[PDB]
């Protein structure tokens, strides 16, 4: 029997109870995991509200750092690293608000020595979608300048550091001084407002850009950029719509991808990047290789005991933490 | 003086009149172009007609193959290889249907001693076209299937012939027997009927892809084949809209090519591929080198007089003319 955080009606905060629960089993392709920091992020609150629907009941959380107990049937060594004692870390854990939980072994990665337990669950999932964005969707050169949106949010904070790491010049935006700071403090060259007209906040960026624009925009907020994103473009560059924080973006007429210079429209998701363990695997260990040499940091900013996960999540709502939060069980 | 095709009014085939026109002098950065072999396309067409509008009088026609005559004021070594006496092409020529015309050296290309005047200018726009293409939009490998609509079209019948040659499966659509077998005979591994479905064609193409989807489509159709393009790309392939001869594609939601998965859309024009004179020459160069070797073939079916340009246009519109159409003066 272990503690855990269990959900058997969906609503608010209020519906998360601290139960006994059983020691789950782990079944075929998965690995029982003894968790060491619990991740606390808003696609929990959707599920628990049931905005996003799941079975009833359900242990509340996917993302999680801890320690393999146990391999389930059809976790062999021929197909994951990932043996019994190994820190590990997943987005795709079922029931991580607890002290134990499973995860699939090919959507799990090793953690190094170096990177602690809290930093791999806050880090994992932004981290994996900077990477794929920025190696995959549009491989990022040396010499290249590229547009990210929201830049003090957890993907565009992990994009900035990345992209200028790798010698890349980012240029972003925010709607706040504070974040503004954030942002800068991230590596950001250049911090904008977000945009108020399309072609206003195009002709700035080409000014920063000695009239080319930009080689790539990471487009995470949607309808209320989407119209600037694509008039910022450098010939032939790469617009990667990856969200809709502000809405979706209204249907594209075609020869706008045409004016714009012939660029590219993308709208990935993370899915269609981590199809098997050994690309999960090559993403997440560039990543944590990154973070192991502080060129990617990731700030925590509240640390919860597992039993106050209710508190966590009226926290996490009312805007009071900065930086990610976590819960230890 | 001189032999040209002038249009002074818009209208029908009868509005091109054969005249005596003064011999044209290269302006800055022209070349003066003694012509030997002069396209006949469907934009000179719209020209004549008004649908594409343009100062009047003119001379008709933009492809040329010819001799470079002369060479106008800031044509410089330093910025080509072309010399007075070299065989050269260009789409972007002025008055093509003229004994004597016009063109930008940084548009024009040369033609290799084993290219004959003919293909050369029924070639070059099409050529082009399918390199930036199946070079830079989508960089075709040994091992990709593809998919081309309108196989039996110029830009189809280049493409088919052209990635076959580079290691690549083509599959095609087209809408009768006779162009299936010059599709076939361009190198087609399966050629198709176009779609009355956009799932069952997917479905269709799926199956002769072991599941997969192709790589990439060029879709130069547009309306009544994009939806079953969309739905028949294999996971982050490129859908390159490069032309709307069905009609023009209704905007397009952004989740379509996330649900298609995380797939790429571009709208290309050749424009934005011939930006420099180094461009266009690469282009034209490898081109040419594939013509020479006879991986590509391209078929010219009509050679006319200069002087019956009109008889020429009315066999064009006619669809009298399998295979390019060319004017020798």
Same mark, same amino acid.
């Given at each position: 029997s272990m503690h855990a955080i269990e959900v058997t009606e969906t609503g608010g905060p209020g519906v998360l109870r601290h139960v006994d629960q059983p020691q789950p089993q782990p079944g075929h392709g998965e690995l029982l995991i003894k968790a060491e920091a619990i991740g606390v992020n808003f696609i929990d609150t959707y599920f628990r509200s049931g905005q996003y629907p799941r079975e009833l009941p359900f242990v509340i959380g996917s993302e999680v750092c801890g320690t393999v107990e146990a391999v389930g049937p059809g976790v062999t060594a021929a197909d994951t690293a990932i043996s019994v004692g190994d820190r590990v870390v997943s987005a795709?854990?079922? %029931? $991580?608000?607890?002290e134990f939980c499973t995860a699939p072994a090919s959507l799990t990665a090793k953690v190094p020595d170096d990177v602690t337990s809290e930093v791999a669950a806050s880090a994992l999932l932004k981290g994996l979608t900077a990477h794929y964005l920025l190696k995959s969707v549009y491989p990022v050169k040396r010499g290249d300048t590229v547009l990210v949106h929201a830049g003090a949010g957890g993907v565009g904070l992990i994009l900035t550091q990345w992209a200028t790491h790798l010698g890349v010049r980012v240029i972003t935006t925010v709607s706040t001084a504070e974040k503004a700071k954030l942002s800068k403090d991230a590596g950001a060259d250049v911090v904008l407002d977000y945009p108020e007209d399309a072609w206003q906040f195009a002709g700035r960026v080409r000014e920063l850009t000695g009239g080319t624009g930009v080689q790539a925009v990471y487009d995470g907020? %949607? $309808?209320?950029t989407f119209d600037a994103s694509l008039a910022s473009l450098a010939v032939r560059g790469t617009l990667?719509?990856?969200?809709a924080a502000s809405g979706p973006v209204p249907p594209?007429?075609?020869q706008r991808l045409n004016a714009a210079g012939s660029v590219y429209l993308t709208r990935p998701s993370l899915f269609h990047f981590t199809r098997t363990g050994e690309e999960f695997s090559w993403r997440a260990a560039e990543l944590f290789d990154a973070i192991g040499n502080e060129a990617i940091t990731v700030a925590v900013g509240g640390r919860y005991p597992l039993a106050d996960a209710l508190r966590a999540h009226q926290d996490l709502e009312a805007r009071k933490t900065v930086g990610s939060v976590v819960l230890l069980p």
């Amino acid at each position: 029997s272990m503690h855990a955080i269990e959900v058997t009606e969906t609503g608010g905060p209020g519906v998360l109870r601290h139960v006994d629960q059983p020691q789950p089993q782990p079944g075929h392709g998965e690995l029982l995991i003894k968790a060491e920091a619990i991740g606390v992020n808003f696609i929990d609150t959707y599920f628990r509200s049931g905005q996003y629907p799941r079975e009833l009941p359900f242990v509340i959380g996917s993302e999680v750092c801890g320690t393999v107990e146990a391999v389930g049937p059809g976790v062999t060594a021929a197909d994951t690293a990932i043996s019994v004692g190994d820190r590990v870390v997943s987005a795709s854990a079922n %029931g $991580a608000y607890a002290e134990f939980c499973t995860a699939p072994a090919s959507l799990t990665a090793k953690v190094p020595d170096d990177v602690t337990s809290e930093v791999a669950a806050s880090a994992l999932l932004k981290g994996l979608t900077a990477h794929y964005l920025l190696k995959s969707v549009y491989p990022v050169k040396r010499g290249d300048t590229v547009l990210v949106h929201a830049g003090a949010g957890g993907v565009g904070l992990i994009l900035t550091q990345w992209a200028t790491h790798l010698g890349v010049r980012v240029i972003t935006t925010v709607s706040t001084a504070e974040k503004a700071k954030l942002s800068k403090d991230a590596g950001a060259d250049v911090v904008l407002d977000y945009p108020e007209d399309a072609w206003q906040f195009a002709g700035r960026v080409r000014e920063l850009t000695g009239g080319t624009g930009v080689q790539a925009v990471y487009d995470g907020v %949607g $309808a209320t950029t989407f119209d600037a994103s694509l008039a910022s473009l450098a010939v032939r560059g790469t617009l990667a719509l990856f969200g809709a924080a502000s809405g979706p973006v209204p249907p594209v007429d075609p020869q706008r991808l045409n004016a714009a210079g012939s660029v590219y429209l993308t709208r990935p998701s993370l899915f269609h990047f981590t199809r098997t363990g050994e690309e999960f695997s090559w993403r997440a260990a560039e990543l944590f290789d990154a973070i192991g040499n502080e060129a990617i940091t990731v700030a925590v900013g509240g640390r919860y005991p597992l039993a106050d996960a209710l508190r966590a999540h009226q926290d996490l709502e009312a805007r009071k933490t900065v930086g990610s939060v976590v819960l230890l069980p």
